Write a protein that binds this DNA or RNA. Structure first.
Ligand code: NA
Ligand code: NA
Length: 318
DNA sequence: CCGACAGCGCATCAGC
DNA sequence: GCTGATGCGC
DNA sequence: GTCGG
């Protein structure tokens, strides 16, 4: 963190500007990817040319690094920070439900601060009101100890609805992370293959675990939950996905991550003669044509098809 | 030089 | 009202 | 913004 922290903070701040103000999502992911590869770089960068050797860092970023290492700042960023419009737009996107488009809309109307939002809740949809209500709590990290407690509640209540259910808490948590930003739960049932989600949500609301709802459909749920007290715990964001039984363990593998791990596994699968997405793993023909989905009854089955040794979730960082 | 870069599920918006 | 586009989260 | 056809 003390190695190239100044560079990674710069690229991250540049990433947010492109996403929120410029609305250039591909430039946003470009800076983050660069900020990521520099973070894992075990040396203190001395020049843009050194970082240029890394994948994801091109000419423009190398040029920016050179300026930062010589001046301690970036003229582009300093002018962006002092810009009233850009800073206000970039900040409002921190509210869940407010993206680049809505933030641009609000700032143009004069709505630039968190207080201005509260004075204009008639201009906000349901999601934005909830995001505003739990603004502070949503930016808080969820310690693993609390994630375990949340997991106990979810697994207990899901089983009380129907013992035939299968629930898996994925994300960085399943990889053994010390903290999380949210809770992603994958759900399935033998009767559902390629009104089960409602019953689970209702039960979690019955024990007052789920407090609010952002979106709710037949296969996907996003809302707000909170751990019971005896100091009251912060409200956390929870997502619950209903996945078909024949596509469940492919989904588990997908949402467990990491993003880099999935990229490598998809690459290794292609060399073995298989293709893997979020839903299914299919064999490839001699002309590149994919066949019918392969039977998956376990996460270890997918590793067996591609002749790969089973990777523990804790060892899926890359 | 120039397109890819993940894209799906849900809520809301724009047009008919 | 329906249908498709847009916006947003992940 | 970077990478690769
Ligand atoms: Na490079
Ligand atoms: Na937001």
């Amino acid at each position: 963190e003390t190695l190239n922290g100044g560079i990674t903070d710069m690229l991250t701040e540049l990433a947010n500007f492109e996403k929120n103000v410029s609305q250039a999502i591909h430039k946003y992911n470009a800076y983050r990817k660069a900020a990521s590869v520099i973070a894992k770089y075990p040396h203190k960068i001395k020049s843009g040319a050194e970082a240029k050797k890394l994948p994801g860092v091109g000419t423009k970023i190398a040029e920016k690094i050179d300026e930062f290492l010589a001046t301690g700042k970036l003229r582009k960023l300093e002018k962006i920070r002092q810009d009233d419009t850009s800073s206000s737009i970039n900040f409002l996107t921190r509210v869940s439900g407010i993206g680049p488009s809505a933030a641009r809309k609000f700032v143009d109307e004069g709505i630039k601060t968190l207080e201005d939002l509260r004075k204009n809740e008639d201009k906000l949809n349901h999601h934005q009101r909830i995001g505003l209500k739990y603004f502070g709590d949503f930016e808080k990290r969820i310690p693993r100890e609390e994630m375990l407690q949340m997991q106990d509640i979810v697994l207990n209540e899901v089983k009380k609805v129907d013992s035939e259910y299968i629930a898996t808490v994925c994300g960085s948590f399943r990889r053994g992370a010390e903290s999380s930003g949210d809770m992603d739960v994958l759900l399935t049932h033998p009767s559902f293959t390629s009104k089960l989600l409602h019953q689970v949500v209702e039960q979690l609301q019955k024990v007052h675990f789920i407090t609010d709802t952002l979106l709710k459909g037949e296969t996907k749920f996003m809302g707000v939950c909170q751990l019971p007290s005896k100091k009251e715990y912060p409200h956390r964001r929870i997502d619950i996905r209903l996945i078909p039984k024949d596509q469940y363990y492919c989904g588990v593998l997908y949402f467990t991550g990491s993003d880099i791990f999935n990229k490598n596994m998809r690459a290794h699968a292609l060399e073995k003669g298989f293709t893997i997405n979020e839903y299914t793993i299919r064999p490839l023909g001699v002309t590149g044509v994919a066949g019918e989905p392969l039977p998956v009854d376990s996460e270890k089955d997918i590793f067996d098809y591609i002749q790969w040794k089973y990777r523990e979730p804790k060892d899926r960082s890359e």
